[PDB]
From Swiss-Prot:
<keyword id="KW-0732">Signal</keyword>
<protein>
    <recommendedName>
        <fullName>Cytochrome c6</fullName>
    </recommendedName>
</protein>
<dbReference type="GO" id="GO:0020037">
    <property type="term" value="F:heme binding"/>
</dbReference>
<dbReference type="GO" id="GO:0009055">
    <property type="term" value="F:electron transfer activity"/>
</dbReference>
<keyword id="KW-0793">Thylakoid</keyword>
<keyword id="KW-0408">Iron</keyword>
<comment type="similarity">
    <text>Belongs to the cytochrome c family. PetJ subfamily.</text>
</comment>
<dbReference type="GO" id="GO:0005506">
    <property type="term" value="F:iron ion binding"/>
</dbReference>
<feature type="binding site" description="axial binding residue">
    <location>
        <position position="65"/>
    </location>
    <ligand>
        <name>heme c</name>
    </ligand>
</feature>
<keyword id="KW-0602">Photosynthesis</keyword>
<keyword id="KW-0249">Electron transport</keyword>
<comment type="function">
    <text>Functions as an electron carrier between membrane-bound cytochrome b6-f and photosystem I in oxygenic photosynthesis.</text>
</comment>
<feature type="binding site" description="covalent">
    <location>
        <position position="14"/>
    </location>
    <ligand>
        <name>heme c</name>
    </ligand>
</feature>
<dbReference type="GO" id="GO:0031979">
    <property type="term" value="C:plasma membrane-derived thylakoid lumen"/>
</dbReference>
<keyword id="KW-0349">Heme</keyword>
<keyword id="KW-0813">Transport</keyword>
<feature type="binding site" description="covalent">
    <location>
        <position position="17"/>
    </location>
    <ligand>
        <name>heme c</name>
    </ligand>
</feature>
Length: 93
């Protein structure tokens, strides 16, 4: 999906909890490449791509993280997932 478009999604929906690609609530579970491969469901076990796994967690929530399905458009979810994947894989946080 569109990483560049996802940056704005992120700014509007995700930065209060994940500023800097970090995690204010659960500090180990950051959006950096190493943490994502350790902790993010689906991605960590090899059964999902990073982008899909981010799309899933955004849509459905996890633990303390709210769900965004029904709050964000399908494109917005897809694009923010692409932004996370791009930031992480390219070490841009
Ligand atoms: C605070 C109220 C949050 C908001 C808003 C968003 N996220 Fe979040 N996220 C939060 C927590 C507490 C966690 C940990 C969940 C757990 O495993 O217990 C997460 C996790 C993620 C992850 C996985 C990180 C990892 O496992 O290392 C991703 C990819 C993620 N969050 C992305 C994300 C996006 C893109 C958001 C805006 C749409 C967003 N989160 C909101 C807390 C909060």
């Amino acid at each position: 999906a569109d990483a560049a478009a996802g940056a704005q999604v992120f700014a509007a929906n995700c930065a209060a909890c994940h500023a800097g690609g970090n995690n204010a609530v659960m500090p180990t579970k950051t959006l950096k490449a190493d943490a994502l491969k350790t902790y993010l469901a689906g991605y960590k076990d090899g059964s999902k791509s990073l982008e899909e796994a981010v799309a899933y967690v955004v849509t459905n929530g996890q633990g303390a993280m709210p769900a965004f399905g029904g709050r964000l458009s399908d494109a917005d979810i897809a694009n923010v997932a692409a932004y996370i994947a791009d930031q992480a894989e390219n070490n841009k946080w």
